[PDB]
Amino acid sequence: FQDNQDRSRVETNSATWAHNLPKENKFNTETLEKQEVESRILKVLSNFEQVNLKNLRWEQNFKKLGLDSLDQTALLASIEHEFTILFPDGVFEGFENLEQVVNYILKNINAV
Amino acid sequence: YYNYFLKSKLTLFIILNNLNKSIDSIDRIFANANWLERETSEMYGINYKWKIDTRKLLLDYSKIENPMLKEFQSEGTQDAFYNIFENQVVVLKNETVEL
Amino acid sequence: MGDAVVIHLIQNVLIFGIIFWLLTWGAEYFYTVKQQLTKKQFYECGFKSISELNIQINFNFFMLAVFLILYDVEFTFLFPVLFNFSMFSTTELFLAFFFIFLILVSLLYDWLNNVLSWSA
Amino acid sequence: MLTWISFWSLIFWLILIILVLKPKNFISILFMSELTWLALYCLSLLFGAIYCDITLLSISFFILGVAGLEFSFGILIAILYKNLNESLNTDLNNNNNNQNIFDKNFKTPLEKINWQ
Amino acid sequence: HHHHAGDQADRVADKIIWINIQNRIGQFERISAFEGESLLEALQRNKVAGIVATCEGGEDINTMLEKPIDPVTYGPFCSSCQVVVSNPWRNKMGNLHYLEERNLVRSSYPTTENSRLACCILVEKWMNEMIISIPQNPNSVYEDNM
Amino acid sequence: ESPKGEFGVSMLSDGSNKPYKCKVRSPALHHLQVLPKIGKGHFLADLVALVGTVDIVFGEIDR
Amino acid sequence: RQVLQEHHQECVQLARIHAEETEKSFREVLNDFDRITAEAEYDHESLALQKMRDLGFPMEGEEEEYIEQRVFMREQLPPLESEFWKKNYDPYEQDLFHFPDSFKAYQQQYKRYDEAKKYFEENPNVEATIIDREFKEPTNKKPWTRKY
Amino acid sequence: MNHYWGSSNTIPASSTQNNNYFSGGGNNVTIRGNEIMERLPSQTPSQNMVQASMKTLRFYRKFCRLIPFILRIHNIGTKFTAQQAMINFGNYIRERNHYRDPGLIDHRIQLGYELLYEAEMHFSQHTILMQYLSPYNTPLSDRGYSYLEKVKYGNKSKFLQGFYKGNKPTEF
Amino acid sequence: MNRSIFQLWKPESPRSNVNSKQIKTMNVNFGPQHPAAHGVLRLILQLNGEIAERFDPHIGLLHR
Amino acid sequence: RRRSVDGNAIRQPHKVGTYAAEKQRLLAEERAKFNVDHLGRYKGGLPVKGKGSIRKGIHGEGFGAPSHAHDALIHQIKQSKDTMDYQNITNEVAQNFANH
Amino acid sequence: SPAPPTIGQVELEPFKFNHERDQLIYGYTMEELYGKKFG
Amino acid sequence: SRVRSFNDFKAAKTYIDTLKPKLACLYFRADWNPLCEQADKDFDKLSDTHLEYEFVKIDIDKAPQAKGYFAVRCEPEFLLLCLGQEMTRQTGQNQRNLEHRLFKVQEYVKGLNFPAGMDTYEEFHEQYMAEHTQLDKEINEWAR
Numbered sequence A: 001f002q003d004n005q006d007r008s009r010v011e012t013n014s015a016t017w018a019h020n021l022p023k024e025n026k027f028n029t030e031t032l033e034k035q036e037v038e039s040r041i042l043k044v045l046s047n048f049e050q051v052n053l054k055n056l057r058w059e060q061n062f063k064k065l066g067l068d069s070l071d072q073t074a075l076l077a078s079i080e081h082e083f084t085i086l087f088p089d090g091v092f093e094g095f096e097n098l099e100q101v102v103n104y105i106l107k108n109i110n111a112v
Numbered sequence B: 001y002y003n004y005f006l007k008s009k010l011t012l013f014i015i016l017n018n019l020n021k022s023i024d025s026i027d028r029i030f031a032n033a034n035w036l037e038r039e040t041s042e043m044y045g046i047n048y049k050w051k052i053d054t055r056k057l058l059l060d061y062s063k064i065e066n067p068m069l070k071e072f073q074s075e076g077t078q079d080a081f082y083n084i085f086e087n088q089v090v091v092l093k094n095e096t097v098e099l
Numbered sequence C: 001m002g003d004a005v006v007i008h009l010i011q012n013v014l015i016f017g018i019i020f021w022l023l024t025w026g027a028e029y030f031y032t033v034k035q036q037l038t039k040k041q042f043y044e045c046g047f048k049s050i051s052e053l054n055i056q057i058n059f060n061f062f063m064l065a066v067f068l069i070l071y072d073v074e075f076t077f078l079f080p081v082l083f084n085f086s087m088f089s090t091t092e093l094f095l096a097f098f099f100i101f102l103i104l105v106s107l108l109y110d111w112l113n114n115v116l117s118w119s120a
Numbered sequence D: 001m002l003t004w005i006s007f008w009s010l011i012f013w014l015i016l017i018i019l020v021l022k023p024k025n026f027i028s029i030l031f032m033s034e035l036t037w038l039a040l041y042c043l044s045l046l047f048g049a050i051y052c053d054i055t056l057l058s059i060s061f062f063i064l065g066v067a068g069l070e071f072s073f074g075i076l077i078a079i080l081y082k083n084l085n086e087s088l089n090t091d092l093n094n095n096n097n098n099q100n101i102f103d104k105n106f107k108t109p110l111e112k113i114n115w116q
Numbered sequence E: 001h002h003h004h005a006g007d008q009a010d011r012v013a014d015k016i017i018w019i020n021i022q023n024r025i026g027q028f029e030r031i032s033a034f035e036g037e038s039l040l041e042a043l044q045r046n047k048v049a050g051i052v053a054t055c056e057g058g059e060d061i062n063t064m065l066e067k068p069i070d071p072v073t074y075g076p077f078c079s080s081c082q083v084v085v086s087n088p089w090r091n092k093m094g095n096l097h098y099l100e101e102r103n104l105v106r107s108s109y110p111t112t113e114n115s116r117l118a119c120c121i122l123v124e125k126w127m128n129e130m131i132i133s134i135p136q137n138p139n140s141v142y143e144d145n146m
Numbered sequence F: 001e002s003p004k005g006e007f008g009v010s011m012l013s014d015g016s017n018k019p020y021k022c023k024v025r026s027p028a029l030h031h032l033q034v035l036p037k038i039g040k041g042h043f044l045a046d047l048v049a050l051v052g053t054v055d056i057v058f059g060e061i062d063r
Numbered sequence G: 001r002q003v004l005q006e007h008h009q010e011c012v013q014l015a016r017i018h019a020e021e022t023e024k025s026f027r028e029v030l031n032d033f034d035r036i037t038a039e040a041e042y043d044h045e046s047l048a049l050q051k052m053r054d055l056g057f058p059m060e061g062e063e064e065e066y067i068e069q070r071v072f073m074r075e076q077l078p079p080l081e082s083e084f085w086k087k088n089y090d091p092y093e094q095d096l097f098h099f100p101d102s103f104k105a106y107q108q109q110y111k112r113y114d115e116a117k118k119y120f121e122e123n124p125n126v127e128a129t130i131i132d133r134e135f136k137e138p139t140n141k142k143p144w145t146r147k148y
Numbered sequence H: 001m002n003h004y005w006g007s008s009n010t011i012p013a014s015s016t017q018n019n020n021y022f023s024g025g026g027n028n029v030t031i032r033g034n035e036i037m038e039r040l041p042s043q044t045p046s047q048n049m050v051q052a053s054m055k056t057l058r059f060y061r062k063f064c065r066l067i068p069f070i071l072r073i074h075n076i077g078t079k080f081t082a083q084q085a086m087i088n089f090g091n092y093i094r095e096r097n098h099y100r101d102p103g104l105i106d107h108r109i110q111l112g113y114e115l116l117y118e119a120e121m122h123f124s125q126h127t128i129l130m131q132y133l134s135p136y137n138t139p140l141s142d143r144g145y146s147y148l149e150k151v152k153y154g155n156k157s158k159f160l161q162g163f164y165k166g167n168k169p170t171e172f
Numbered sequence I: 001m002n003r004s005i006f007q008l009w010k011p012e013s014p015r016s017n018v019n020s021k022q023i024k025t026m027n028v029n030f031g032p033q034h035p036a037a038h039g040v041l042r043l044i045l046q047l048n049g050e051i052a053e054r055f056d057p058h059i060g061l062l063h064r
Numbered sequence J: 001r002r003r004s005v006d007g008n009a010i011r012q013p014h015k016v017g018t019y020a021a022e023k024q025r026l027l028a029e030e031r032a033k034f035n036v037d038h039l040g041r042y043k044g045g046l047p048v049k050g051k052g053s054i055r056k057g058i059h060g061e062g063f064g065a066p067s068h069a070h071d072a073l074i075h076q077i078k079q080s081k082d083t084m085d086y087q088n089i090t091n092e093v094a095q096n097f098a099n100h
Numbered sequence K: 001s002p003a004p005p006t007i008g009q010v011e012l013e014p015f016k017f018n019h020e021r022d023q024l025i026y027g028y029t030m031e032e033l034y035g036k037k038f039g
Numbered sequence L: 001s002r003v004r005s006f007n008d009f010k011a012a013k014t015y016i017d018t019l020k021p022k023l024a025c026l027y028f029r030a031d032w033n034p035l036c037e038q039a040d041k042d043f044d045k046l047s048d049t050h051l052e053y054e055f056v057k058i059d060i061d062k063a064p065q066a067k068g069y070f071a072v073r074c075e076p077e078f079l080l081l082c083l084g085q086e087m088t089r090q091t092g093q094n095q096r097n098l099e100h101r102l103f104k105v106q107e108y109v110k111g112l113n114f115p116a117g118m119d120t121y122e123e124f125h126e127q128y129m130a131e132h133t134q135l136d137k138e139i140n141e142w143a144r
């Protein structure tokens, strides 16, 4: 019987020698977890010693954290280098808080 | 400039008094004005606005100065020696011999 | 077109090369070199080269190479006929003339298309 | 070791097989085709030696010309790969997953699949 | 409609369905569509780019636009009307049919988890201010560039 | 009229024993500014030949 | 009123174009038909050649021997001082005034412009910032406290 | 665009493909361009300090985006980390934060972009480019540090420390 | 002879990968220490197939 | 929500002294130069000889077909012939970087 | 005012190629206009 | 099971190699990340509920060689290795995500049918060394 519930075919193979655990879908649309994003952002913030990461409120202002453009754009560039992703000029100029930055990073599927 | 049609020489003198020393660029008009205006900006700091090319012409690399200025002394400020600690050429302050 | 005599000659040439290598070692025994920062760097007229492996050419002579291969094949084909031209016949002359005409027509067509010049 | 005819036939068949064994590169395919044509010419020479036939030996020049034509066509095709925006390694032109490639990974060229 | 006698005609602007689409030049463009029209039809009327639309909507009889989809339907005929819908729009759309999934799976270009056929997409009042993206669909045959 | 063209000196003196300013218009600088406009489309050997035929002395350009 | 005036001007321009078209003779009409027919069979190379001929490009090898005099030696016209006297010089972009708010985040952050304007109005003259050259221990002793 | 920062001045990933068989792309924001920078047009005249500040921020971001490649290519990553180099450059830029002339700011930005392109083209020696990226008040992380002054001049005021050293040679 | 203009020109179209310089540019430099560079010029010349495409002459190497 | 004459709903405009308002006015003026609709679609106009489907408007001439998409890159290239104030981070540039 | 005579953009060029020479020389011959050229 | 902690790289490596655990959960921690204490508590709690994987806790600060061997790009990290082969990783601190990953890893490991004799434990560096010998070594020899 042509079971419509079985959409599997030869083109649907999703086995790779790279990933030990087989991927969910053939399209490798795996977005980063908020936990991994937070860990990377914590490392990036630890790069700039002028801020205390222990009591970090992710929704606070960069200026309140102690960052101007010389630090805020520097932190954004460091995050971009770590994630190998380029923020569009509007996103870079409009990033207001670490929580918003984390949300934007999580949304991107090209992040790595 | 030299006019071959009239076979004469003309000299336009523009007086600059603004602190920025910014003037329009004739590079888009005369082709030779590119390198000329580049050298002029590199030597005297005359800012050719809307210029074809703002790249440096004769000044030394990694050197930010205007040697062709009334303030600049003959010896400058930076002199390059060979840093054995770096195994390459380094730059330090210029301590020159005076007459 | 070669034999075991040629093989032994190649072996003796390798022996002579080994002798040259010994001479080179003896000559290098009288020199002392101190390592420098750019001692083992690429020589690019006084500055560090901006590329290491990404040295790619445009390859504008591809048609020339293909035509050269074709002409080599044609010349190799023509060679056996001229190798024994002493016993040429009417059919042999006709075939040689046809081959020559074909080669000439091919060359003219290649020139007729301006394909013998480099392109951007 | 093996007799010459058997060695030549086995080598021709193994070369034909190995032409598919290696990865899918056009330049490698052209080189393998040239090697196969040379092996065919060698086999023809060996057969002409075995049977003492003039027509069998006459193949080498025709075989050489055919091989040259094929090599020129392959070179021209490979040159055209630059303008077609297709990589020389043909496996990178297909989205089907394969276990032979260590680093194959293709994703849609977009930023965010779900916008808000 | 339920329009009564003597009532004035309704402005088409009140029935304008807004679709914000990310075109292959990475451009945010706003298209307007009418209720009941296919996404492929709206794109063709608005001259949207990036959609090859090889099948031009596929078959005309027992098409996927009919509701409910008939069991004898042949499904899509090409793989060119590929549009990635937003999370709310794709969630409201539901699961693709068996033929839709079979056709979308056999696509040369990579597809996304929210990829649906524009010719198989129907205009619903729920799709107001809908977000879509149009990655460059593949080109198949020699007449595709004609 | 030097052999390379019109070599000019513009001297402005403020009355002192040293000129206030002394600019040098060397035709070699003009020849160097036009080589790219003349070098376009030429091969490497042709570029070398044009550099030879541009009659540019590096000392005149450098000043 | 502006829309009506623009419609009237467009109508005048269309009338001028049509009169340019409507006043053709028999020879002109035949030539136009032949041109349409040739365009129906002119390849992309033919269109490029027509454009090059309109641009004065060489039409033979002998002329191409000195082609650089035409394509390359022709210097570009200088720009306009009106273009030099411009109002804004930012890159062109679509006005995301009615677009979805998710797409509105990708537009230029005009709020930063107003904030910087307020800051600059408040800070017209600023004292020089002095970066101290006083010696201090490293903030990250890892360059001097690394074991492996 | 026909500029050094143009999108088309990117090295193709493959010898026959730009990025991949399904889409194109290249890296030029964080790496060098495909061809040399023939012309460097002057910055558009900004009549507002707000525009000047925006241009300065853009230049700082562009410099930061190439700090990794600049450090990696010059083999000068040992002197300071990429974040450390960014912090030092930010401090150096803050040193000139007192400027208030839009024309001077534009000229400085053009000169800095030219210098960065020269560094991107490796036309300048690494030992000289380290002057801008060196730490302001800390020892270089590529060499050991001696706290002889900090120990001997412990809690000593700046005037006393300067008096104890001597401003000129003690022999002549 | 016949027309060969197309074999000599190759302009770049907007976002056209085919019309772009589909080759790794050999950014070789006629640096100072070259027999034909006159010693005091670094002519960074973008050359494509031994044919110079772009020119950028680094001068001032002997500026005194 | 209630909608204006256009298909988009009514939205409050920016402040009078807003740089956003100034930029919107400038964007509309620049759009009039290349015959771009308020939605950014190359509109119609008087037909132009040798320009294909592209027509001629009142405040300028279009760069595409009627009711087409006005490419931002094309407008930027046309307006600034070679001026690159900065390597502007656009969506297309970010997509190219992500592809790389 | 009468319409000014057409002025070609290809015209006013320092040199004329074969096509431009044919366009300008319509109605005459090369020897008729510029005289006979000798070798 | 229970979390077994080791502050010596050699000791931890020997302990891991001796047991030949089918599933190994390595909790690598560093004092740089302020959220490591919560990660340590989560690892201790989850060590009991899932005895299928052996839980080994290493502090990167006290064991610098561990970071090099495990290629830990950031801390805290939870590396799930199957028979010595790297199966999955958790870069952040998330109890729910860690539990889901552990369940998925257990299911995937159970679902495999390893051929007899080829189901032996291997060192974590074996895969990297083989990959270098197969791909990196040839490229390095061809280049330099």
Ligand code: FES
Pocket (backbone or CB within 6 Å): E040, E053, E054, E055, E056, E057, E058, E076, E077, E078, E079, E080, E081, E082, E117, E118, E119, E120
């Ligand atoms: S028209 Fe073919 S996929 Fe829809």
